[PDB]
Symmetry: C3
């Protein structure tokens, strides 16, 4: 019942409308599990109480993080796939505040604020996993 009222089936996939306090990537993980999404693309917009990005450091194998608060999310773009049996969301975003200046990159997590988040999901029939590309030491989406 977690996702009750938070999405609708569309001809090409789903439309999701998340609400105050919803954890965006976790709700996309739950959609993947509830609807058994083989793989998907998505885009979205909304208003976030917090958005955390990471810039990956290959040397020390860690994301350097940064958190923004009470920001408009001008765009999110990403994919749904799987890794080790669990949903594996890969999302980027662009956020702006009352200066209107943009920031963002690779999303680690984000939470809807006093607003909503509209997400347009295009679902594919192929079950896709992500794997570590040994040439670069990063996760990449595998295609058939």
């Amino acid at each position: 019942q977690e996702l009750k009222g938070k999405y609708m089936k569309t001809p090409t996939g789903y439309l999701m409308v998340l609400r105050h306090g919803d954890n965006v990537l976790q709700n996309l993980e739950q959609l993947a599990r509830d609807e058994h999404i083989p793989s998907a693309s998505f885009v979205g917009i909304g208003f976030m109480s917090e958005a955390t990005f990471g810039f990956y450091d290959f040397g020390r194998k860690q994301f350097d993080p940064k958190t923004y608060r009470n920001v408009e999310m001008a765009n999110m773009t990403g994919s749904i796939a799987w890794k080790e049996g669990k949903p594996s969301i890969h999302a980027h975003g662009t956020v702006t505040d009352g200066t209107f200046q943009g920031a963002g990159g690779h999303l680690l997590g984000l939470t809807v604020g006093t607003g909503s988040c509209e997400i347009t999901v295009t679902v594919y029939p192929q079950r896709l996993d992500r794997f570590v590309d040994p040439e670069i030491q990063a996760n990449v989406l595998g295609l058939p």
Copy 2:
């Protein structure tokens, strides 16, 4: 005849190409009315003579606005729905100038400059309204 030559039907919705001087959100409103769009998602790009954003102030119930001139629109992302019988466009954007620095957020209005605006519209069969969410005092897209 307003929209003559400005869009084509696609398998999933429409593709719109707006031209010098066109008011982007107003042309999306007109597409909604002319094609009786129940609801839709969209993304787009273009070059704007002006783009006006707003950062909403919940205390005084007003957007603080900011206008940018002669800017590339690196992305727009949004939705078409209805409110009180009229089209209700919810759009965000990201704009850049000759410094290449990004800015944007919630769009209040924008006008195509010496360029064009390409808009990819995905149309859904469900008629959707936006409503004020009393928990947050903001418009949210209602789903069935």
Copy 3:
């Protein structure tokens, strides 16, 4: 064989996953030629070893360019069409670095770094050309 393993057919078009060292717009040109794409929209994300943008100068008929290195591409949005028999890609992007500040605009070229690039392509049945709009001295996508 250039594009072997780099894309899959989807119900609405293609999904492309480009890899370290791939030239993004050139690979989209090659997809257009290999799959005889009449026209298309796309969005994408990835990590770029370099991304070059241009801000067009109408007076001297040239793009002023700027190159960013080792950047996350928070979004790309664009279209595939044709001009003089050759693919004509029109793409914008938004990139961020370890400051998380955003930059971008009109893309002249970009190369995948130690990462990948996921591209969601929506294909239309209509063959579209771009043409110079004599009122503005810029290329615009022509519609039927």
